[PDB]
Amino acid sequence: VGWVTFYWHWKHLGIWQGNVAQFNENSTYLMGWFRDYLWANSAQLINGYNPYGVNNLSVWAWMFLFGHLVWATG
Amino acid sequence: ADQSSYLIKFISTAPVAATIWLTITAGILIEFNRFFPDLLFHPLP
Amino acid sequence: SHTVKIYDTCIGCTQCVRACPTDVLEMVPWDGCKAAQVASSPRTEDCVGCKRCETACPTDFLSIRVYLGAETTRSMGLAY
Amino acid sequence: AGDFLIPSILFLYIAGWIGWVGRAYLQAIKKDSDTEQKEIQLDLGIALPIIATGFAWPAAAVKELLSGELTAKDSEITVSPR
Amino acid sequence: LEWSPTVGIIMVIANVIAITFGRQTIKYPSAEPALPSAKFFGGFGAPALLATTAFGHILGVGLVLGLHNLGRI
Amino acid sequence: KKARVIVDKDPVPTSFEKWAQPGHFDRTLARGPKTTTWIWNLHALAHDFDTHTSDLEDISRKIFAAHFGHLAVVTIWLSGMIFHGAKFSNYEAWLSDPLNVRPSAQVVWPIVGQDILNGDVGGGFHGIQITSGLFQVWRGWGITNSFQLYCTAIGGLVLAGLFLFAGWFHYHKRAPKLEWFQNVESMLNHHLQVLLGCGSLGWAGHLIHVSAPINKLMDAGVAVKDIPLPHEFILNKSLLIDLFPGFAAGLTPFFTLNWGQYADFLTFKGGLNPVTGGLWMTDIAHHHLAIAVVFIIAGHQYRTNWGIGHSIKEILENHKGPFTGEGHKGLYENLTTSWHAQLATNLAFLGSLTIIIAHHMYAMPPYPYLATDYATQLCIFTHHIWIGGFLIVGGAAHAAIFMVRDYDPVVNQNNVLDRVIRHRDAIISHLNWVCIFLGFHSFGLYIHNDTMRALGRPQDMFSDTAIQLQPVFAQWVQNLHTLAPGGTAPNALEPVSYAFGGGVLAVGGKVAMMPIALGTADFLIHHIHAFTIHVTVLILLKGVLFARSSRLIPDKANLGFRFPCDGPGRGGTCQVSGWDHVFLGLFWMYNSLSIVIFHFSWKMQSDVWGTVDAAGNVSHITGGNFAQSAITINGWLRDFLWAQASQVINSYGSALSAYGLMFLGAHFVWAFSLMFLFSGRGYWQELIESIVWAHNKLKVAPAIQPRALSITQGRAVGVAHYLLGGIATTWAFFHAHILSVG
Amino acid sequence: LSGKTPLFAGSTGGLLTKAVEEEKYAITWTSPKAQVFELPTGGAATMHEGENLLYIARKEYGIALGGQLRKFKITNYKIYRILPSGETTFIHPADGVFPEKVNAGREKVRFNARSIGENPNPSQVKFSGKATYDA
Ligand code: CLA
Ligand code: CLA
Ligand SMILES: CCCCCCCCCCCCCCCC(=O)OC[C@H](COP(=O)(O)OC[C@@H](O)CO)OC(=O)CCCCCCCCCCCCCCC
Ligand SMILES: CC1=C(C/C=C(\C)CCC[C@H](C)CCC[C@H](C)CCCC(C)C)C(=O)c2ccccc2C1=O
Ligand code: SF4
Ligand code: SF4
Ligand code: SF4
């Protein structure tokens, strides 16, 4: 389900911006998934709180780290 | 040449025979792709 | 306690009784094998459940089985 | 045809070569009085004529199939309780 | 530090102190190759003798370099 | 008893007969395989010489021959590295321009597209940039051309073949007896004198005559071709006296103790060379002279054939006291009758020493033009810290193997080993408490900081602009080190390192070393380190103290060192063995050392490394963000892992693309470990049953029957892939970031 | 019970609060000489020449200890269960003969007069007190 929702999300996130070419050109190899989907889209998430301030994505940043902690406690 | 019998039994053992055979196979593929590279598909007439 | 059963495929080689670390097992007289002895488990209240008896058993698909059950102080192996 | 059909035929021929030679070697060594020792130490005098013979694995496989020698019976090989 | 016979006599004094301690408190001072005298030596082996004089050189070099560093010698 | 040479002549005949017999060494493996478990047991038991034979003399002969084989392969490795520096290298182009040519060996052959890895590394050369620092080592050796490297590599090949012949010789022709090995006083005297002191004295001779004149002419900036060959410093003495005027007096001030004449080339300068950023070669020569004299003196402590000296047994028996019973009576018999006890001590202390070497070589960079090469500085630090951690876990493993196999209660009776056994519950429960305390007050402070920063409350954080945790003791120690020249160390000019204080030393516009200021983030991360080491020590010490018995399983030493469990009873007794504690401790060693090398990388890029302005302003690589971002987990996520992995994932279609490939392949191997870690073998054996059915159907079932891996092997494969994947991930990440920003 | 407690300086591995509250065990043996053995709780102790008496937390401790008393050729070891009422029962060996040897007067307990593939299905015994292994 992680594969199917990563796929759904990255394809639609291309459509929602007018850039299907990013998915169509970069999903044939795994670094495109890694870079253009995991690295590129997590940028604004982990800036939900930072040394300069806080915006409305700080719950989701805190939850993101929380989920890493619960997963690794497993 | 009784020691050579033991040597050919050592070559016949599974890791040594595997590394000789796979070295030959990797050498065939590497020397084929030195001379005829970039074959994504078989070209048709 | 746990439950330790013995089936009639026993050949009486005494190895489960030697394997037991808590004296659950013993050898009783019999006429069902050449060795003329079975295993028997009278002290199953002392069974920790460690299944050394099943490891020691040589008959193909064991003549002794441990069925794990209600846990007590002895079966949990607690020294406190 | 060169995109997938030609490499398909080429792979299936080489893979049937490898598999048929391995099957022939395991069947040839199961009668020679210590089978397990000959699996880690290869009989070259048995294996090398088999790897030379393996060019005609499709004809050998079809003759193995029609004569009922390709498969063992379901009553001859082990299973677990249902 | 230019060499003077004060440096020689402090090296000899450190050798005498070290052979004194080597006579007083070595557990096995009589090894196999013994000295020819063994009466002016107190009863030694040659390895115990040159052990004592090597340690006297340790002490003497340390002494003369320390006293040169102070300003005495 | 005296130390002498007694040798059996021709113990074992040289023949290829047993090479045709796999597993000839074990009596249970010599019967041949029935299952595939046999094949893995052949490799698990290949070097377990206690299972080979029960006789300590043949065990010792096997160990002594296998050491020569290992020395042969290490000398082949070293002569290979020197040969690549001779032939496939830009070393001569690097000598002329050490600040702008990147060091490279390993040209890649042009096949399937892989010649993109031949980057423009400068000097008119294409290849892979190297980070092992061999260029700096050959530079500090004074090597000026390729032919000297060819001579060194040929001599290394000769020396490797000579070791390999010595290993053949001392197992088949002339093999020593048992009492030859048990002359530990003789061996300590010879190692401390010849192997350490005479070696360091001969190296001081090389440094005085070859390395220091050639490197002094390099620092003057003459040429690579105008600097003469180093035998013209011995034959023509005027070339020394032009450089080092202390040679005009000759050897007469050495024997007349006028040692201040030699102060030209035996300095105590303290800091770094401002041209290279390395240590002064006269300091290094003087170091090796002092160290050599101390080692030669130290190797006379121990009694041998001539009465004078010490019995180590008599030293150990006198060090008892009122708390510790008999003291160290019996520890001599442990270390002279058990090779595992020796391997435990040497492995633990050699790993601790390599971690010390890693901390010393970043802060006091020895080699010329090493400190400005930030890639080499990162890589050799992290490399030797990993070697340290692995060797320490090995020392714990062999301590536990001693405790299972070679421990004798009759030898160890009311001594310090017997007394630590008899209060092992107190030791382990207090260490449990310590580990929980350190976890709460190291990591919970980061969780506090995360939550306070996310809740919009940065005035409540533990930081430098909020509630402060200053490292007052480490700041005090660094103050004492800054003030040591002229004060407590009067004959030093500059401090030992610039990491404590003394100012920025710039070489080629980049920082060689500058003061490393310590604050709240540094307080927090040093307690992370204390926590993760103490937990690793808890796991390994628990496995060594409970290797023979616990409250749960009394006869644990009957079950061995390496066993999976003792069944699902007693609640379940999985992973009670000492081996399983080594297993669990490898992960915590990994955890600890990953945080150590991450601390290092981000503290250096944030607060040390960087470019120096012509005015004198230091502009760091990550711009001083360690102080406010290393105090949360979100900061370490974003500003360290997310921000610095920009260069390994953008690396395709360039010279660093193999680093991105290794990055993804290492994540693969890491994730692939978890199949082995999270599962057990009943599943895998039952799946193999249906696959063996499909082979029995087509008459392709092998007589060597397929088995799933043993419980111990499944754990071993899981930890080997977990470590391999995680370390290769950090390797590719570090390489691709530091070859781009530094 | 009769016997001298073996000579050692104590350990943290010994008897805890379970001994005074529910159960305590003891092993006695006679030794021909004084010699060093290994305690089940960890550590070296010396057994006395003559009878001995060492208290232990669990029965398994005494069976491990009596297993290593076979290696000193001491085979008269007896194990006692001790309750906080002072009630001492003799448990091992319980018959007087070690259980490896067949002695008469021993009855079968938990014997099933069938092989193990002849147990009933769990659905055949469902919603009753019996298990598939019970007879
Ligand atoms: C003699 C070689 C041989 C042959 C003919 C087969 C045949 C088969 N295997 Mg297979 N297998 C083998 C070796 C072999 N196996 C080995 C060594 C292993 C352990 C790695 C397995 C593990 C394995 C699994 C786990 C599964 C099969 C399955 C199958 C079936 C479907 C084809 C397939 O999935 O292949 C896949 C097989 C592999 C990927 C294994 C690699 C094959 C090796 C590299 C080649 C062996 C050649 C041999 C060593 C050379 C000896 C020659 C002699 C001259 C010395 C088919 C009956 C599947 C099945 O049951 O489906 C119904 C299945 O799930 N195999
Ligand atoms: C992220 C993953 C993770 C975490 C959190 C832990 C946590 C822990 N492991 Mg560990 N472990 C892990 C992965 C992890 N492990 C893995 C992957 C392995 C496999 C090899 C192991 C193997 C292992 C062993 C073998 C050992 C441990 C030990 C420990 C403990 C360390 C000492 C301690 O108490 O620290 C303090 C606890 C923490 C720092 C955890 C976080 C606590 C938070 C910050 C505070 C609580 C927040 C809040 C107040 C809660 C309120 C909740 C709300 C409902 C009100 C701790 C409980 C050791 C142990 O037990 O020693 C005592 C030990 O021996 N673990
Ligand atoms: C493994 C690492 C141990 C470190 C753990 C730290 C806290 C644990 C303390 C637990 C109490 C243990 C009870 C001891 C056992 C006991 O019986 O104590 C008594 C013991 C002395 O015993 P005896 O006098 O019988 O000893 C005589 C013979 O045993 C031979 O010495 O004293 C200690 O060693 C206390 C000192 C330990 C204090 C550790 C000091 C560490 C020094 C660090 C130097 C580092 C470099 C510093 C540079 C600035
Ligand atoms: C996946 C997995 C397996 C399955 C893995 C097995 C059975 C071993 C892996 C198969 C080996 C690698 C096959 C080797 C076969 C031949 C040597 C291949 C020869 C091919 C030639 C070309 C060399 C376990 O057995 C296991 C056991 C205990 C805990 C966890 C696990 C676990 O997670
Ligand atoms: S499970 Fe253990 S205690 Fe129970 S009978 Fe078997 S071996 Fe004995
Ligand atoms: S159950 Fe097994 S070990 Fe026990 S008596 Fe029967 S065959 Fe022997
Ligand atoms: S789950 Fe596995 S390791 Fe654990 S007790 Fe059971 S068989 Fe043993």
mmCIF file of N, CA and C in Angstrom, chain D residues 7-82:
data_model
loop_
_atom_site.group_PDB
_atom_site.id
_atom_site.type_symbol
_atom_site.label_atom_id
_atom_site.label_comp_id
_atom_site.label_asym_id
_atom_site.label_seq_id
_atom_site.Cartn_x
_atom_site.Cartn_y
_atom_site.Cartn_z
ATOM 1 N N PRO D 7 14.869 -11.308 -27.905
ATOM 2 C CA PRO D 7 15.505 -11.653 -26.625
ATOM 3 C C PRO D 7 14.758 -12.695 -25.832
ATOM 4 N N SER D 8 13.449 -12.834 -26.044
ATOM 5 C CA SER D 8 12.684 -13.882 -25.380
ATOM 6 C C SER D 8 13.124 -15.259 -25.834
ATOM 7 N N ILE D 9 13.225 -15.455 -27.150
ATOM 8 C CA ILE D 9 13.654 -16.736 -27.700
ATOM 9 C C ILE D 9 15.074 -17.043 -27.266
ATOM 10 N N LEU D 10 15.932 -16.018 -27.279
ATOM 11 C CA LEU D 10 17.330 -16.199 -26.912
ATOM 12 C C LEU D 10 17.479 -16.577 -25.439
ATOM 13 N N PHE D 11 16.762 -15.870 -24.549
ATOM 14 C CA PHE D 11 16.803 -16.206 -23.131
ATOM 15 C C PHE D 11 16.252 -17.594 -22.873
ATOM 16 N N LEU D 12 15.081 -17.914 -23.438
ATOM 17 C CA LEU D 12 14.441 -19.185 -23.125
ATOM 18 C C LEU D 12 15.276 -20.359 -23.600
ATOM 19 N N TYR D 13 15.995 -20.197 -24.717
ATOM 20 C CA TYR D 13 16.918 -21.237 -25.156
ATOM 21 C C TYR D 13 18.085 -21.406 -24.185
ATOM 22 N N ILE D 14 18.708 -20.301 -23.762
ATOM 23 C CA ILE D 14 19.854 -20.412 -22.853
ATOM 24 C C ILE D 14 19.424 -20.892 -21.462
ATOM 25 N N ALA D 15 18.250 -20.470 -21.005
ATOM 26 C CA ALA D 15 17.774 -20.856 -19.683
ATOM 27 C C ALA D 15 17.336 -22.307 -19.651
ATOM 28 N N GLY D 16 16.727 -22.786 -20.735
ATOM 29 C CA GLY D 16 16.447 -24.199 -20.835
ATOM 30 C C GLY D 16 17.695 -25.042 -20.947
ATOM 31 N N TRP D 17 18.746 -24.513 -21.597
ATOM 32 C CA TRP D 17 20.048 -25.178 -21.617
ATOM 33 C C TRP D 17 20.564 -25.385 -20.198
ATOM 34 N N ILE D 18 20.603 -24.300 -19.413
ATOM 35 C CA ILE D 18 21.137 -24.340 -18.047
ATOM 36 C C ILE D 18 20.312 -25.272 -17.169
ATOM 37 N N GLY D 19 18.986 -25.144 -17.236
ATOM 38 C CA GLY D 19 18.127 -25.963 -16.398
ATOM 39 C C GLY D 19 18.135 -27.427 -16.787
ATOM 40 N N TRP D 20 18.194 -27.713 -18.090
ATOM 41 C CA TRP D 20 18.185 -29.092 -18.550
ATOM 42 C C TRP D 20 19.503 -29.777 -18.239
ATOM 43 N N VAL D 21 20.608 -29.040 -18.342
ATOM 44 C CA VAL D 21 21.911 -29.576 -17.972
ATOM 45 C C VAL D 21 21.986 -29.843 -16.471
ATOM 46 N N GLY D 22 21.424 -28.950 -15.651
ATOM 47 C CA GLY D 22 21.395 -29.200 -14.215
ATOM 48 C C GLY D 22 20.536 -30.391 -13.826
ATOM 49 N N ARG D 23 19.381 -30.549 -14.486
ATOM 50 C CA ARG D 23 18.520 -31.704 -14.249
ATOM 51 C C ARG D 23 19.193 -32.999 -14.678
ATOM 52 N N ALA D 24 19.888 -32.972 -15.815
ATOM 53 C CA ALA D 24 20.579 -34.160 -16.298
ATOM 54 C C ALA D 24 21.740 -34.537 -15.391
ATOM 55 N N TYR D 25 22.431 -33.544 -14.824
ATOM 56 C CA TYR D 25 23.540 -33.854 -13.929
ATOM 57 C C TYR D 25 23.048 -34.434 -12.609
ATOM 58 N N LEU D 26 22.001 -33.837 -12.022
ATOM 59 C CA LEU D 26 21.446 -34.385 -10.787
ATOM 60 C C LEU D 26 20.865 -35.774 -10.984
ATOM 61 N N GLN D 27 20.266 -36.047 -12.140
ATOM 62 C CA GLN D 27 19.780 -37.397 -12.379
ATOM 63 C C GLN D 27 20.909 -38.375 -12.666
ATOM 64 N N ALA D 28 22.013 -37.911 -13.253
ATOM 65 C CA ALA D 28 23.117 -38.816 -13.535
ATOM 66 C C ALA D 28 23.889 -39.176 -12.278
ATOM 67 N N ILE D 29 23.918 -38.288 -11.281
ATOM 68 C CA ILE D 29 24.712 -38.569 -10.089
ATOM 69 C C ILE D 29 23.939 -39.260 -8.975
ATOM 70 N N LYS D 30 22.620 -39.431 -9.103
ATOM 71 C CA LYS D 30 21.857 -40.085 -8.040
ATOM 72 C C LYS D 30 22.033 -41.592 -7.995
ATOM 73 N N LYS D 31 22.796 -42.172 -8.912
ATOM 74 C CA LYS D 31 23.063 -43.599 -8.898
ATOM 75 C C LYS D 31 24.502 -43.939 -8.538
ATOM 76 N N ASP D 32 25.383 -42.951 -8.429
ATOM 77 C CA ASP D 32 26.814 -43.206 -8.255
ATOM 78 C C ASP D 32 27.237 -43.194 -6.788
ATOM 79 N N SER D 33 26.485 -43.888 -5.929
ATOM 80 C CA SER D 33 26.921 -44.446 -4.644
ATOM 81 C C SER D 33 27.266 -43.453 -3.534
ATOM 82 N N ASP D 34 27.456 -42.175 -3.866
ATOM 83 C CA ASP D 34 27.522 -41.104 -2.866
ATOM 84 C C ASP D 34 27.131 -39.813 -3.595
ATOM 85 N N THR D 35 25.853 -39.469 -3.494
ATOM 86 C CA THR D 35 25.323 -38.415 -4.339
ATOM 87 C C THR D 35 25.670 -37.041 -3.786
ATOM 88 N N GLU D 36 25.625 -36.888 -2.459
ATOM 89 C CA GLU D 36 25.801 -35.580 -1.836
ATOM 90 C C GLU D 36 27.223 -35.067 -1.988
ATOM 91 N N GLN D 37 28.203 -35.969 -2.011
ATOM 92 C CA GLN D 37 29.589 -35.557 -2.178
ATOM 93 C C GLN D 37 29.847 -35.053 -3.586
ATOM 94 N N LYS D 38 29.141 -35.598 -4.567
ATOM 95 C CA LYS D 38 29.287 -35.181 -5.951
ATOM 96 C C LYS D 38 28.515 -33.915 -6.280
ATOM 97 N N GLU D 39 27.779 -33.350 -5.330
ATOM 98 C CA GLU D 39 27.120 -32.077 -5.577
ATOM 99 C C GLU D 39 27.983 -30.891 -5.185
ATOM 100 N N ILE D 40 28.820 -31.034 -4.157
ATOM 101 C CA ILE D 40 29.814 -30.015 -3.841
ATOM 102 C C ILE D 40 31.126 -30.210 -4.591
ATOM 103 N N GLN D 41 31.431 -31.428 -5.032
ATOM 104 C CA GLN D 41 32.606 -31.712 -5.850
ATOM 105 C C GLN D 41 32.146 -32.304 -7.170
ATOM 106 N N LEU D 42 32.229 -31.515 -8.233
ATOM 107 C CA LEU D 42 31.625 -31.892 -9.499
ATOM 108 C C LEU D 42 32.439 -32.973 -10.194
ATOM 109 N N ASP D 43 31.757 -33.995 -10.695
ATOM 110 C CA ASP D 43 32.382 -34.924 -11.628
ATOM 111 C C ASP D 43 32.462 -34.246 -12.983
ATOM 112 N N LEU D 44 33.665 -33.841 -13.385
ATOM 113 C CA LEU D 44 33.810 -33.189 -14.679
ATOM 114 C C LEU D 44 33.604 -34.170 -15.821
ATOM 115 N N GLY D 45 33.969 -35.438 -15.615
ATOM 116 C CA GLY D 45 33.723 -36.469 -16.605
ATOM 117 C C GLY D 45 32.264 -36.822 -16.783
ATOM 118 N N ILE D 46 31.415 -36.449 -15.834
ATOM 119 C CA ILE D 46 29.975 -36.581 -16.014
ATOM 120 C C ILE D 46 29.358 -35.266 -16.469
ATOM 121 N N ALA D 47 29.801 -34.143 -15.905
ATOM 122 C CA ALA D 47 29.143 -32.869 -16.173
ATOM 123 C C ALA D 47 29.481 -32.319 -17.550
ATOM 124 N N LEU D 48 30.747 -32.372 -17.956
ATOM 125 C CA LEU D 48 31.161 -31.779 -19.226
ATOM 126 C C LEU D 48 30.565 -32.431 -20.484
ATOM 127 N N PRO D 49 30.405 -33.764 -20.589
ATOM 128 C CA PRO D 49 29.579 -34.271 -21.697
ATOM 129 C C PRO D 49 28.118 -33.869 -21.608
ATOM 130 N N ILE D 50 27.586 -33.633 -20.408
ATOM 131 C CA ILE D 50 26.210 -33.160 -20.289
ATOM 132 C C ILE D 50 26.090 -31.710 -20.752
ATOM 133 N N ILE D 51 27.052 -30.854 -20.387
ATOM 134 C CA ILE D 51 26.992 -29.479 -20.875
ATOM 135 C C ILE D 51 27.332 -29.394 -22.357
ATOM 136 N N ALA D 52 27.981 -30.413 -22.925
ATOM 137 C CA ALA D 52 28.124 -30.448 -24.373
ATOM 138 C C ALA D 52 26.853 -30.938 -25.049
ATOM 139 N N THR D 53 26.151 -31.879 -24.430
ATOM 140 C CA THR D 53 24.936 -32.464 -24.973
ATOM 141 C C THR D 53 23.754 -31.500 -24.918
ATOM 142 N N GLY D 54 23.772 -30.533 -24.005
ATOM 143 C CA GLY D 54 22.631 -29.670 -23.756
ATOM 144 C C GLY D 54 22.194 -28.704 -24.847
ATOM 145 N N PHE D 55 22.741 -28.781 -26.060
ATOM 146 C CA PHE D 55 22.297 -27.902 -27.137
ATOM 147 C C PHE D 55 20.900 -28.259 -27.627
ATOM 148 N N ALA D 56 20.505 -29.519 -27.493
ATOM 149 C CA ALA D 56 19.234 -30.024 -27.990
ATOM 150 C C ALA D 56 18.260 -30.295 -26.853
ATOM 151 N N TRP D 57 18.240 -29.412 -25.856
ATOM 152 C CA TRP D 57 17.268 -29.546 -24.777
ATOM 153 C C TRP D 57 15.787 -29.481 -25.180
ATOM 154 N N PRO D 58 15.325 -28.780 -26.242
ATOM 155 C CA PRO D 58 13.878 -28.858 -26.519
ATOM 156 C C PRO D 58 13.420 -30.217 -27.014
ATOM 157 N N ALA D 59 14.187 -30.861 -27.897
ATOM 158 C CA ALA D 59 13.830 -32.198 -28.358
ATOM 159 C C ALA D 59 13.911 -33.214 -27.227
ATOM 160 N N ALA D 60 14.944 -33.106 -26.390
ATOM 161 C CA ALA D 60 15.084 -33.991 -25.239
ATOM 162 C C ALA D 60 13.968 -33.774 -24.229
ATOM 163 N N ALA D 61 13.535 -32.525 -24.052
ATOM 164 C CA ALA D 61 12.451 -32.229 -23.122
ATOM 165 C C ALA D 61 11.110 -32.730 -23.641
ATOM 166 N N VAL D 62 10.872 -32.637 -24.953
ATOM 167 C CA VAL D 62 9.614 -33.136 -25.506
ATOM 168 C C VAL D 62 9.572 -34.663 -25.467
ATOM 169 N N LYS D 63 10.703 -35.323 -25.745
ATOM 170 C CA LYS D 63 10.753 -36.777 -25.607
ATOM 171 C C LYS D 63 10.662 -37.212 -24.150
ATOM 172 N N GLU D 64 11.136 -36.375 -23.228
ATOM 173 C CA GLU D 64 10.969 -36.639 -21.804
ATOM 174 C C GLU D 64 9.515 -36.473 -21.387
ATOM 175 N N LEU D 65 8.809 -35.538 -22.027
ATOM 176 C CA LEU D 65 7.419 -35.249 -21.689
ATOM 177 C C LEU D 65 6.479 -36.333 -22.195
ATOM 178 N N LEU D 66 6.657 -36.763 -23.447
ATOM 179 C CA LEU D 66 5.703 -37.693 -24.045
ATOM 180 C C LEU D 66 5.833 -39.095 -23.468
ATOM 181 N N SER D 67 7.017 -39.463 -22.993
ATOM 182 C CA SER D 67 7.240 -40.788 -22.438
ATOM 183 C C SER D 67 6.904 -40.880 -20.959
ATOM 184 N N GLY D 68 6.394 -39.810 -20.356
ATOM 185 C CA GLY D 68 6.045 -39.845 -18.950
ATOM 186 C C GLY D 68 7.220 -39.863 -18.005
ATOM 187 N N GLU D 69 8.389 -39.422 -18.453
ATOM 188 C CA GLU D 69 9.582 -39.402 -17.623
ATOM 189 C C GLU D 69 9.915 -38.018 -17.096
ATOM 190 N N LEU D 70 9.140 -37.000 -17.464
ATOM 191 C CA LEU D 70 9.438 -35.650 -17.014
ATOM 192 C C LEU D 70 9.015 -35.442 -15.570
ATOM 193 N N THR D 71 7.886 -36.015 -15.173
ATOM 194 C CA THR D 71 7.334 -35.793 -13.849
ATOM 195 C C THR D 71 7.264 -37.085 -13.057
ATOM 196 N N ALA D 72 7.393 -36.949 -11.745
ATOM 197 C CA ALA D 72 7.095 -38.013 -10.804
ATOM 198 C C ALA D 72 5.624 -37.961 -10.409
ATOM 199 N N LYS D 73 5.119 -39.084 -9.912
ATOM 200 C CA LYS D 73 3.718 -39.146 -9.532
ATOM 201 C C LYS D 73 3.502 -38.485 -8.177
ATOM 202 N N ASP D 74 2.271 -38.016 -7.960
ATOM 203 C CA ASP D 74 1.937 -37.340 -6.713
ATOM 204 C C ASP D 74 1.906 -38.285 -5.521
ATOM 205 N N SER D 75 1.804 -39.589 -5.753
ATOM 206 C CA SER D 75 1.881 -40.572 -4.685
ATOM 207 C C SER D 75 3.308 -40.997 -4.376
ATOM 208 N N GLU D 76 4.269 -40.589 -5.200
ATOM 209 C CA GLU D 76 5.661 -40.990 -5.071
ATOM 210 C C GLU D 76 6.505 -39.991 -4.304
ATOM 211 N N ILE D 77 6.012 -38.775 -4.107
ATOM 212 C CA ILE D 77 6.795 -37.696 -3.526
ATOM 213 C C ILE D 77 6.070 -37.169 -2.300
ATOM 214 N N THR D 78 6.846 -36.671 -1.342
ATOM 215 C CA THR D 78 6.348 -36.470 0.010
ATOM 216 C C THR D 78 5.455 -35.238 0.123
ATOM 217 N N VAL D 79 4.475 -35.327 1.021
ATOM 218 C CA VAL D 79 3.597 -34.220 1.376
ATOM 219 C C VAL D 79 3.438 -34.202 2.889
ATOM 220 N N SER D 80 2.724 -33.201 3.365
ATOM 221 C CA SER D 80 2.465 -32.922 4.762
ATOM 222 C C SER D 80 1.004 -33.203 5.104
ATOM 223 N N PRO D 81 0.666 -33.391 6.387
ATOM 224 C CA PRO D 81 -0.726 -33.708 6.735
ATOM 225 C C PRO D 81 -1.686 -32.554 6.484
ATOM 226 N N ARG D 82 -2.834 -32.893 5.912
ATOM 227 C CA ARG D 82 -3.821 -31.913 5.471
ATOM 228 C C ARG D 82 -4.809 -31.530 6.576
#
